């Protein structure tokens, strides 16, 4: 949702630095979302995003580092298996197949570093980076703000997001993923799945190369 803090800027060097793992999701109209590469064959996104495929992961296209609708520098990877988080939060792993050159998604971009969240606190400056639907299709935007709430598996912030941002990584100042954006409440806050210790266990047990720091 759009909040009084609406500080959003387009990313152009989408294959460089921590942006390469940020991914555009397209599911045939169409729905679109966001996600983040975190392992050799794996992205994180929302349940409500992968649910749009109606049980067929092959309906999901993942474009890591997408720059615009005519510029997918790392091509696409097709959904292979949906692994929902068992807990009551909007988090899923999407395992993708290798591409047409037999490259794995976590070989073409550097998988994102996950935060242990040992230091994460309210008032901390963060970003949410992904593919908002008010902007041109498949353009990457970074939104700037602060954490306002941490509780259980919920982390909320005062920065603006728009439909299409679902699944976007929430980055701390070290460019580590602290949460996965899922939506918000008009005029109040936006919300993410907080990567707490239980979420970290789920990641380790499904993504053996997960990099938690």
Curated annotation (Swiss-Prot):
Enzyme Commission no: 3.4.21.19
Substrates-to-products reaction catalysed: Preferential cleavage: Glu-|-Xaa, Asp-|-Xaa
Active site: 48, 90, 166
Subcellular location: Secreted
The UniProt record lists the keyword Hydrolase: yes
GO-annotated molecular function: serine-type endopeptidase activity
Any one annotated GO CC term: extracellular region
A GO BP annotation: proteolysis
Major localization listed first in the record, in broad terms: secreted
Function comment: Exhibits a significant hydrolytic activity for the carbonyl side of glutamic acid. Shows activity toward human fibronectin and type 1 collagen.
Similarity field: Belongs to the peptidase S1B family.
Protein name in UniProt: Glutamyl endopeptidase
Organism: Staphylococcus epidermidis (strain ATCC 12228 / FDA PCI 1200)
Portion of the parent chain present: 67 to 282 of 282
């Amino acid at each position: 949702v759009i909040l009084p803090n609406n500080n959003r800027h387009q990313i152009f060097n989408t294959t460089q630095g921590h942006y390469d793992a940020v991914s555009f999701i397209y599911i045939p109209g169409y729905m679109s979302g966001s996600g983040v590469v975190v392992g050799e064959n794996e992205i994180l996104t929302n349940k409500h995003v992968v649910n749009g495929a109606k049980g067929n992961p092959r309906n999901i296209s993942v474009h890591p580092s997408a720059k615009n609708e005519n510029d997918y520098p790392n091509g696409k990877f097709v959904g292979q298996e949906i692994i929902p988080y068992p807990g009551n939060s909007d988090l899923a792993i999407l395992r993708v197949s290798p591409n047409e050159h037999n490259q794995h998604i976590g070989q073409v971009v550097k998988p994102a570093t996950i935060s242990s969240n040992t230091d994460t606190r309210i008032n901390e400056n963060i970003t949410v980076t992904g593919y908002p639907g008010d902007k041109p299709l498949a353009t990457m935007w970074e939104s700037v703000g602060k954490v306002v709430y941490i509780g259980g598996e919920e982390l909320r912030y005062d920065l603006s997001t728009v439909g299409g941002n679902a699944g976007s990584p929430v980055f701390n100042g070290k460019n580590q993923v602290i949460g996965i954006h899922y939506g918000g409440v008009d005029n109040k806050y936006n919300s993410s799945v907080y990567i707490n210790d239980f979420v970290q266990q789920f990641l380790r047990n499904n993504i053996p190369d997960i990099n938690i720091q």
